[PDB]
């Protein structure tokens, strides 16, 4: 599937909605690991 949505999907199955994962990814530069790292530290 599409990468952009693929990241948000995997992140949605961790403990946060697709919305929070969406913003996190984009800002971090649509980076998956960075996204999770965002939900981890970034607040």
């Amino acid at each position: 599937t599409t990468p952009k949505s693929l990241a948000v999907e995997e992140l949605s199955g961790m403990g946060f909605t697709e919305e929070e994962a969406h913003n996190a990814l984009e800002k971090c530069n649509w980076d998956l690991e960075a996204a999770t790292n965002f939900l981890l530290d970034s607040a």
Binding site: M14, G15, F16, E33, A34, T36, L40
Partner: protein, 76 residues
């Protein structure tokens, strides 16, 4: 009790721990298991990152729980 670690690469890891195990120990196990850098990998559960040092009971970590493993990454 066993835990199912999930790497962001598409790899599943099954580790065998006890009710007295600790986070720091889990990391070392993974290192000797595959080779994921311990100084990078980080344990996660229900969204909350498992702080190194504490046990599995401090986070209500049940059995066969779905754990996550994310690297610290570099961005300095």
């Amino acid at each position: 009790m066993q835990i199912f670690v999930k790497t962001l690469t598409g790899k599943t890891i099954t580790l065998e721990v006890e009710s007295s195990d600790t986070i720091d120990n889990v990391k070392s196990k993974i290192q000797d298991k595959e080779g994921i850098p311990p100084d990078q990998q980080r344990l996660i559960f229900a969204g909350k990152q498992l702080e190194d040092g504490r046990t599995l009971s401090d986070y209500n970590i049940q059995k066969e729980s779905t754990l996550h493993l994310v690297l610290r990454l570099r961005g300095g």
